[PDB]
Amino acid sequence: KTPDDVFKLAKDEKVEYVDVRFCDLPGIMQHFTIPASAFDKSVFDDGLAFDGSSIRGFQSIHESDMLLLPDPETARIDPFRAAKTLNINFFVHDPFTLEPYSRDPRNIARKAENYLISTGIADTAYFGAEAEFYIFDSVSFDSRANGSFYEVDAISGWWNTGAATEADGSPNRGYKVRHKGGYFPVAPNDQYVDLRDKMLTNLINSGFILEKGHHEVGSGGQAEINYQFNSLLHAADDMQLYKYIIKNTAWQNGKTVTFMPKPLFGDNGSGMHCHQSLWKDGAPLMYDETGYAGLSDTARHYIGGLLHHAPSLLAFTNPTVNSYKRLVPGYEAPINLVYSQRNRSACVRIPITGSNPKAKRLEFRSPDSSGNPYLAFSAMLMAGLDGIKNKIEPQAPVDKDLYELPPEEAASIPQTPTQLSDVIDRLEADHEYLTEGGVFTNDLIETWISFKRENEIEPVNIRPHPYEFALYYDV
Amino acid sequence: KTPDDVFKLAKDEKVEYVDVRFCDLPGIMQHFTIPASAFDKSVFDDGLAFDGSSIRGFQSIHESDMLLLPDPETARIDPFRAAKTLNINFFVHDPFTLEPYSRDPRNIARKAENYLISTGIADTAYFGAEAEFYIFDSVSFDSRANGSFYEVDAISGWWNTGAATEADGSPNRGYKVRHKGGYFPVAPNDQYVDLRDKMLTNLINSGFILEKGHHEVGSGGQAEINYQFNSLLHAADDMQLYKYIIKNTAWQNGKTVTFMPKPLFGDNGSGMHCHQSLWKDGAPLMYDETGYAGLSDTARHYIGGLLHHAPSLLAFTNPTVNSYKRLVPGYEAPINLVYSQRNRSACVRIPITGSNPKAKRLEFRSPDSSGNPYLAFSAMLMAGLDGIKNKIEPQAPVDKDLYELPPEEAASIPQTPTQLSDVIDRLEADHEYLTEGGVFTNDLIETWISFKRENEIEPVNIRPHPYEFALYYDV
Amino acid sequence: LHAADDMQLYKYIIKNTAWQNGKTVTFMPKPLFGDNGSGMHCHQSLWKDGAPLMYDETGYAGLSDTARHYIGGLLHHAPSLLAFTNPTVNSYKRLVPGYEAPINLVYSQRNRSACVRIPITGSNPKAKRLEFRSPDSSGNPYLAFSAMLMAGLDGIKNKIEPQAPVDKDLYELPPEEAASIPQTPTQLSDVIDRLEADHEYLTEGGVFTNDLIETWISFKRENEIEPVNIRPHPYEFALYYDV
Amino acid sequence: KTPDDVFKLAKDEKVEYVDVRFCDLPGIMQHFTIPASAFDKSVFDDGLAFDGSSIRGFQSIHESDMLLLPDPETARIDPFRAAKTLNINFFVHDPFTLEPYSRDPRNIARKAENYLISTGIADTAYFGAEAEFYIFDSVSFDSRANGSFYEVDAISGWWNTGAATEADGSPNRGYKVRHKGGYFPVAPNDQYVDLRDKMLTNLINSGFILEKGHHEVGSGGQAEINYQFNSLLHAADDMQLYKYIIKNTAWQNGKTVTFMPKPLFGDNGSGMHCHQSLWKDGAPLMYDETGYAGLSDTARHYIGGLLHHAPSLLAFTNPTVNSYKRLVPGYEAPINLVYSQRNRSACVRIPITGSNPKAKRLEFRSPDSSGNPYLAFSAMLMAGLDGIKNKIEPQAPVDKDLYELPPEEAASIPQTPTQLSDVIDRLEADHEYLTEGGVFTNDLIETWISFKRENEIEPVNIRPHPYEFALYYDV
Ligand SMILES: COc1ccc2cc(-c3nc(C(C)(C)C)[nH]c3-c3ccnc(N)c3)ccc2c1
Ligand SMILES: COc1ccc2cc(-c3nc(C(C)(C)C)[nH]c3-c3ccnc(N)c3)ccc2c1
Ligand SMILES: COc1ccc2cc(-c3nc(C(C)(C)C)[nH]c3-c3ccnc(N)c3)ccc2c1
Ligand SMILES: C[S@](=O)(CC[C@H](N)C(=O)O)=NP(=O)(O)O
Ligand SMILES: C[S@](=O)(CC[C@H](N)C(=O)O)=NP(=O)(O)O
Ligand SMILES: C[S@](=O)(CC[C@H](N)C(=O)O)=NP(=O)(O)O
Ligand SMILES: C[S@](=O)(CC[C@H](N)C(=O)O)=NP(=O)(O)O
């Protein structure tokens, strides 16, 4: 798309407002609105200003002013606003030099794609993502001097089988979902068919090419929708728009969605599996009929990179304290650093795709939706490329239920990290593969580390956990 | 129907979504949705993937990926979804070899039909089913360390005659159904006429050929709807679609349906009587004007097989712990292994059909709706075929009220099994008739036995029953 | 006899002390799911002319031949004996693994996972005895104590050898070794069935008579086994409402 | 005291019951009651039995039987029970060999005292302890699939200044305690004067020699009572009895006490400061008028041991997950490994005592009351003795407010450990100083490590924290 394409779209759709969007460092989209009458060439030539000091991971207060420049490829009609609105993503730029911002997640993705080309290894990295989520009815929580709580709730939650009535006083009609039992019985066990249909339709209407939708394993309304893969940057833009459409379709229909990794204890977490492949000149590079699981050397070394760099890479792919509550055995999330075909207990699964080279790819199962897809996809690529460049050999595939391994065998396999502080520590110690070609810079890495320590790790560490009262009140 | 018939139907009905369905081992339909735009030749040629490890009785996690291939004969428009949807049943296949899965219930029914043809005994097994159900208003239940409960409720339930008001605060207007008195007074005693009409209409609109609908014996909204018989596999597909339509028609109209065998204590259970007959080259094989109740030798030996194999066959026809609460005297369900014409106390009843050979058949009254109709119909066929093949003579018909037999004559007649663990034990010991022709395989039988022990028998056995408190609190 | 009279008076005193102080006591075997049941362990010994018969310093766990054969009787007759020592439907909810009640028919010293535990008592012959851990308080101590005695006496009289002691955690046995050890019965109807089939050891000397045994069997079937069997369990709704 | 002293006491006090007490591994006293008529010589000669498999950190089920032998020095009349009762502590012994149990905490303290004598360094280790606690009104908590909470409450809690009424509906009369403001205004600001007087009186009546009692810093009823120091084993027996008397005095007066390290967020935690000194032949060893803070070489090396071994020693002195919520800056608990005179921000404070050598001692401020005083005191002694034996020099004292240090300066002094798993890891790697003289054995250490990982560390790590919902619900 071009500037004129977007003006034509705005005029043809009789748009009243344009919503100007960009990504903060942690991974939440930010926006303000301008009237259609203020959406002109000047927006493309001069850009628009905002307060960089109010955005997380951006500027200090005395260097606050920042600039935004539009990305016409991202233009979509908003499905939700009563006043017709056109959404457009922007790149953040220095207001003096007009140089791209070093802490703009969209710029990182841009740099990753260009660095890929410059290596000669490939020209395109394709990402297909599966962002699972929960469709809840309610949530509340607080944290005080003398107490703390959370509660999420959902009509289909198994914890509600004994409820005398529903939240509105209507009768309990059963057909609630058992823990680990949501994947994927027909209605009325599946209570979210019509809502997920609306989500699917909203996505179709925003130009997504859809593949499937279904209830997921978790009780209390776990769900998954799949759309067509795309190249790195487009894929990360798609992810952000997808989360927006999912959350707001739920909202407009009286529900509340979360993408957090582990909202329920003793039921499945929500992952963001990333299917990845490299292509060059319109041809796939991942396939070799003679390799294990049909994998070429390039593919195997990419995996070698992911598994070798995992202890620091998870700082971007599993970036929250809650992430590490998902990385526990028995829930189809990884607990150790292995690859294996057909294996949903592994860190990297190779899906069964047959002899078609175009379909051959790896599924990185470790990542979740709790962070920044621009940074996450970029970091994965940089790990994989380091793997290829250094010919990093992964340890042998383990074609077993990785949660049921004998002690002697399990201990010869590197584990996933236990907690956020460990991966942040490791990122600080070893991040050279990310800085290759200036894709990630030290200022971004240092800001990230600092942000996670001060705003996440420390605040959780100093606050007493309710289960400590269960354990220790009577010491 | 062919692939092109289904594409034409999808296009003519302006379908937005296709719902991909298959059967788990215990007997619940599973589904995910794809857009109409993804429903193409590739769905027929390459199939679709799912996670076999999340489906009960299927795969382990390290061998998770499974494949689905469509069955065009099963294509129907969904009556419920606001976004126009086409439902299609699939067969489950190995993703490497594309071999039919040994634990796909739809495959077992396929295999049973082929085995029948290969014996030369007949070419067609027809099944007519009567799946009774209850239309409740509510249900709740739970199970904790210090207590446990269930409660079902229904406006027409006799337990509510003394209620001051209905659930919504409106007046009690009487005309509630007496225990064992629901079959079948006119409205207003029958409070479900309009709802059953809606169920009937939804079935007609999904291509069912309807025979009748009525209130059943049980208080609190017991019901029965009959549709035309069909050959085994088609009949099992019809049963699954029927349960879906009944449950969801109820759900959309503010009710809640259960097909469990015995939700009410001291009132009728819900059975799945199976009327069965064999045909060859378009001619019936069950009829002989000179036999007892018009039955041929072939028919009598089929019955011999059902009654001889019953102690293990009920593992598939009466597959739940709750099944055995229905097999008690006084409620038109069987308590012993006899056949008899006109006799609703018997295990096999021969309905009165006159001299028309095409109407001659046996009614197996033992089965209920708590399991898997693909496996249940197949197992019944295998038992009946073993009877024909071995010329198993049933014991003499007993034309009496089998609940009022003097202890002396009753002691000579074999009883129905008391509990699930007994039939599971017997299935394990003796299942050769099921494995004939590889219709059932040992892996299916072993998985079934193991599933029932670990997920049903044991969990119920270890949990104190509320009536034990009535009996023993004061010991 | 004195011990059975003591047991009845004890239950009365416990229940009523609780009652007078605003509480309510139950002796049922398993009132809580996922926590310990309540047993009635019976420590037993035979004496003659003021001297103990259970002790032999050379035997496993200090046990004489007389003691070992008594145990042989308890464990051999268990499938029918539990009809009097574990006489309720609720009894069988207690005989599950992980709660210091028995799940199989073995004896073993120091072992709270076993059916018969030999407590550690040292060299004093007067303290030597066996602890039968299987019984609970849900029945009749007069009949329970008597039945245990009759089983133990049949063991002595027929020199019934118990199978070898198993000094392990009987709940953590590998499926292989566990398959070789006889299990405790699963349910009341099984022990009642077995009592009906084989009760000769109880009728010795006319201690139990056939009228008592027949009345017992008939009572348990009609008033306990059948009434529980015909009533849907709440967990069946958890399992099957949505079938 | 002797056996006959105890019999005389029991007879003179007209005791009806004797309470038999011993310590489990984590640090909770266990008990059963025998009638006075069963308390005879046999209790001393033969001992009493119990089920070692029901006691945490003791026996497996197949080796369950354990033996108890009385310690006549510990006999005290119980202040609480209406039926007159004598409490006696016991040692746990092997029932075959009568050898002292290797996992009896009271045995470890016994061993530690003997090992001290055997080194020739000193013959007596004196411990003066300050076990702070909270006097709350209520507590509740739970942990479910979809939510979790705790709440503590106290009339004097600052969170209650805006309450319309008190819990019983009586008026809010103010005079509540500000956060960090409880040390130590007069009544009515101090609302616990009469209750602490009752606690003081019960202690005096159980033969404690009292020094002081006061409100402590924390809002919502923090308190401290001090009794006279003693030698190691007697001191640990005194601590256990003290906790019992405090808890039950509170209970009988309608309150609820906790000794947990950090029950309130943003207010003082509760420590167990341990004042320590070594004496030989009735003379003190800690004093040298020429040393910093009046400390001898022996004293300085003992401190060297404490600080050097701290990373593993805290596994016994700070043994819970909640312990590490107290080791945060700003609350008069340590955040780093320094000693300093007069300094309540330090790990080891040297109180100001003047020129009297008998009063010279070190205050180890790190420990809390959440574990086992027998093991805690013993472990501290072992670390100190290793310091003396190896002449470990502590780093120079730092006479500054350790919480106010700019971050670059703070980083130049070794920190206290962040979390329990770290000290448990370190204990596993390095514990030789504890095994000297067989005082701690490998079986105890391995059981401890194993208990903490399986029952505490892992269960807390897998459970989502309420503040994670505050941080991440909307990711
Ligand atoms: C038959 O030719 C193709 C070409 C590309 C294909 C791509 C996918 C694909 N789907 C997904 C999700 C949406 C299920 C996560 N990811 C991919 C994907 C992602 C990255 N690279 C490739 N090659 C495929 C799936 C099938 C394909 C088939
Ligand atoms: C007059 O010619 C016929 C031919 C087939 C007929 C089949 C039925 C039939 N109806 C039922 C239900 C729906 C009431 C359970 N089952 C059968 C049935 C089933 C299997 N085989 C046969 N022959 C009949 C009933 C009447 C028939 C009459
Ligand atoms: C004047 O002679 C002495 C002798 C011993 C003394 C002991 C203490 C003392 N008090 C405490 C608490 C109760 C406040 C924690 N701890 C000690 C203590 C503990 C261990 N060793 C010594 N020397 C003193 C305090 C003053 C002393 C004064
Ligand atoms: C069924 S699942 O394996 C579940 C994944 C799980 N929720 C996770 O935490 O990654 N996902 P998919 O089959 O869509 O890859
Ligand atoms: C009236 S009934 O006999 C009732 C059957 C009963 N509910 C059963 O449990 O099988 N059924 P039908 O007459 O439809 O065969
Ligand atoms: C501690 S326990 O082993 C518990 C026995 C358990 N309640 C039972 O059901 O037998 N009893 P004891 O040690 O008194 O013999
Ligand atoms: C006033 S304080 O310094 C407070 C100690 C704090 N509660 C702690 O957590 O160690 N105690 P003390 O003066 O009794 O040694």
Ligand SMILES: [Cl-]
């Ligand atoms: Cl962390």
Ligand SMILES: [Cl-]
């Ligand atoms: Cl059963």
Ligand SMILES: [Cl-]
């Ligand atoms: Cl039973």
Ligand SMILES: [Cl-]
């Ligand atoms: Cl920890």
Ligand SMILES: [Mg+2]
């Ligand atoms: Mg998926």
Ligand SMILES: [Mg+2]
């Ligand atoms: Mg998924």
Ligand SMILES: [Mg+2]
């Ligand atoms: Mg996936």
Ligand SMILES: [Mg+2]
């Ligand atoms: Mg009918």
Ligand SMILES: [Mg+2]
């Ligand atoms: Mg009927």
Ligand SMILES: [Mg+2]
């Ligand atoms: Mg019928």
Ligand SMILES: [Mg+2]
């Ligand atoms: Mg006992």
Ligand SMILES: [Mg+2]
């Ligand atoms: Mg103090």
Ligand SMILES: [Mg+2]
């Ligand atoms: Mg203090």
Ligand SMILES: [Mg+2]
């Ligand atoms: Mg102090």
